[PDB]
Design a protein around this ligand. Structure first.
Ligand SMILES: [Mg+2]
Length: 112
């Protein structure tokens, strides 16, 4: 798919020196929205850094945002087509998104 990621404007990590390292520290601590912002900053500062795109995608999947995860993972795959962790993560996020959407459609059928 699409590799055009919708970066959040006004990202505070844009004026930090090492947002990759902060991202990895926050991800390890389970502070996912902040980690995702830190990785978005890395992806804008260093757009060819495939590990930044992969980390952004994996963080977004962990933070239940599989649509955004897929765009970042697609960008990672374009940068390093041989990264098979990215291949597996893309298949996982597509399945996650499909399952969540089916669950919501089932619940809305019941409620409405
Ligand atoms: Mg999930």
């Amino acid at each position: 798919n699409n590799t055009d990621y919708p970066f959040e404007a006004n990202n505070p990590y844009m004026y930090h020196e090492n947002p990759m390292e902060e991202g990895l520290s926050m991800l390890k601590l389970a502070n996912l929205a902040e980690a995702a912002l830190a990785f978005e900053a890395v992806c804008q500062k260093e757009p060819e850094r495939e590990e930044a795109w992969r980390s952004l995608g994996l963080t977004q999947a962990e933070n239940e945002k599989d649509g955004l995860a897929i765009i970042a993972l697609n960008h990672a795959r374009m940068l390093d087509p041989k990264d098979i962790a990215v291949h597996a993560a893309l298949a996982v996020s597509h399945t996650n998104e499909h399952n969540a959407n089916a669950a919501l459609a089932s619940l809305r059928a019941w409620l409405l």
